[PDB]
Amino acid sequence: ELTPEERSELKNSIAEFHTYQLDPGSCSSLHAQRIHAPPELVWSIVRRFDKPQTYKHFIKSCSVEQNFEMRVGCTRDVIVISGLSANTSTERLDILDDERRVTGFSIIGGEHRLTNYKSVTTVHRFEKENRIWTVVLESYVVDMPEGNSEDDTRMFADTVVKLNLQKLATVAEAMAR
Amino acid sequence: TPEERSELKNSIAEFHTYQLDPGSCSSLHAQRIHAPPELVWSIVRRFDKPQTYKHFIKSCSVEQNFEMRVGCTRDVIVISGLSANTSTERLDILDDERRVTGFSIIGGEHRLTNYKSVTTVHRFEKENRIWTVVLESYVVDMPDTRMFADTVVKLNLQKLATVAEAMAR
Ligand SMILES: O=S(=O)(NCc1ccccn1)c1ccc(Br)c2ccccc12
Ligand SMILES: O=S(=O)(NCc1ccccn1)c1cccc2ccccc12
Ligand SMILES: [Cl-]
Ligand code: NA
């Protein structure tokens, strides 16, 4: 859990990249992760649009186009493990900024229930005297689905984001170690 | 550590060693937890409340006259987002003296047939400090699914550590 000082530092960034204009029947979350590791090492991992399996769980495969150029606008085709109710996810790059260290994607297809899913990730340096760590921020907006709460999966999406941010931290940290 | 490893060999031999069937596969995992063993043990012994240290648990239902005894079962419904749906699990072993427990799935709406598991809590005192090493093994029939079971076990062990470390502090 971020410290009050950490929180204050990120206020501006949250307003810039992680503030969404919601549609009626949609919602938004925001998570945070502290990583004892250099920021630019963490970005290298995060920016790899063609390789999410590196920091995300449950990914069986991730394929892209052959003459693939990782610019905004390009897509990826994720296949998720069997054991998750989801099958295939077509995901589009929305933002990449090696400068500001911001990235983001939107789901534009695939056999799943969530519609109009869209998330944004940002990386942040924290120099305090002796040392240097990172804080990552991952927000997302997704429609409020129609049907009984039997089947609402917004809680899952949420702990997925959380689980992946833990793996990212683990992965990023064992590279500095 | 190579040293932690040396002390658990025996326990692996007694509790985490399986007689495979043709088509099944076994696996072992370890987790270092900064917290006392009795604290850890006291969480993982709670058969009626696995959600306390596991991910993805919609519900867990036992029974109102539930006494915690080998043979007893529990009904678990998974969060939504996961294919398999509900599962029936029975307590295979409970030993508060050697701190060992285990269960096997005996029903449910899924693919993991003949899934069986064992968990052990181990003590480790070093310079002054006192930590814990947990071991979890499992066996399952194989016909994509071993991958998911393995991922789950690791995650759950990671939640256990989080939860137990949070309780000590
Ligand atoms: O029912 S369980 O409590 N079994 C315990 C357990 C632990 C590890 C792997 C499989 N099983 C359970 C927890 C979490 C998940 Br995901 C499960 C998914 C399918 C079936 C059961 C699941
Ligand atoms: O395909 S994903 O890698 N997309 C990224 C992502 C992450 C969290 C929530 C949704 N989307 C993915 C992984 C795990 C669960 C998912 C369930 C539905 C759709 C995609 C899933
Ligand atoms: Cl994984
Ligand atoms: Na589901």
Runs of H (alpha helix) within chain B? 2-15, 37-44, 145-168
- CA dist B6 and B49 (Å) reads 32
Domain A1-177 has CATH 3.30.530.20: yes
Query: In this structure, what token pair is assigned to residue B9?
Result: 């060999």
Answer yes or no: are the C-beta atoms of A137 and A125 closer than 8 Å.
no
Determine contact: A57 vs chain B, CB below 8 A.
yes
The annotated binding site of A is made up of 56, 86-91, 113-119, 138
- CA dist B80 and B59 (Å) reads 11
- The string over A108-131, giving b where at least 16 C-beta atoms fall within 10 Å of a residue's C-beta and e elsewhere, is eebebbbeebbbbbbbbebeeeee
Smallest Cα distance from A57 to chain B, Å: 8
Q: Which residues lie near ion ligand 3 (Cβ < 5 Å)?
A: A 57; B 151
- CA dist B42 and B138 (Å) reads 21
Contacts of B151 in chain A (CB under 8 A): 57-58, 81
Contacts of B83 in chain A (CB under 8 A): 82-85
Which of A81, A83, A163 lies nearest to residue B155, judging by beta carbons?
A163
- Helices B37-44 and B145-168 meet at what angle, rounded to 10? 130
Determine contact: A147 vs chain B, CB below 8 A.
no
Shortest CA distance to B29 belongs to which of B167, B158, B166, B162?
A: B158
Query: In this structure, what token pair is assigned to residue B145?
Result: 């699914």
Determine contact: B83 vs chain A, CB below 8 A.
yes
Smallest Cα distance from B134 to chain A, Å: 19
Query: In this structure, what token pair is assigned to residue B80?
Result: 């939504």
Tokens 């938004």 correspond to A28
Contacts of A153 in chain B (CB under 8 A): 80-81
Query: In this structure, what token pair is assigned to residue B66?
Result: 């539930």
Cα→Cα distances A40→A94, A100, A121, A135, Å:
20, 11, 14, 11
Shortest CA distance to A53 belongs to which of A76, A72, A26, A20?
A: A76
Q: How would you classify the pairing of strands B57-61 and B73-78?
A: antiparallel
Which of B82, B111, B148 lies nearest to residue A85, judging by beta carbons?
B82
Q: Residue B82 gets which letter from DSSP?
A: B
Contact between A156 and B81 using a beta-carbon 8 Å cutoff: yes
Instruction: Write the DSSP assignment of A63-120 as a string of letters.
Output: E--TT---STT-EEEEEEPBTBS--EEEEEEEEEETTTTEEEEEEEE-SSS--S-EEE
Which positions 95-124 of A are in contact with B (Cβ < 8 Å)?
none
Solving technique: X-ray
Which of B80, B144, B147 lies nearest to residue A152, judging by beta carbons?
B80
- The string over B116-152, giving b where at least 16 C-beta atoms fall within 10 Å of a residue's C-beta and e elsewhere, is bbbbbbbebeeeeeebbbbbbbbbbbeeebbebbeeb
Determine contact: B142 vs chain A, CB below 8 A.
no
Contacts of A57 in chain B (CB under 8 A): 151, 155
Answer yes or no: are the C-beta atoms of A71 and A93 closer than 8 Å.
yes
Which of A83, A153, A159 lies nearest to residue B84, judging by beta carbons?
A83
- CA dist B120 and B96 (Å) reads 10
What topology is assigned to B1-169 in CATH? Alpha-D-Glucose-1,6-Bisphosphate; Chain A, domain 4 (3.30.530)
Query: In this structure, what token pair is assigned to residue B56?
Result: 């993805």
Chosen for mutation from B54, B110, B145, B148 (greatest number of chain A CBs closer than 10 Å) is B148
- CA dist A43 and A45 (Å) reads 5
Instruction: Write the DSSP assignment of A20-68 as a string of letters.
Output: --PPTTEEEEEEEEEESS-HHHHHHHHH-TT-GGGT-SSEEEEE--TT-
Does the C-beta of B78 come closer than 6 Å to ligand 1? yes
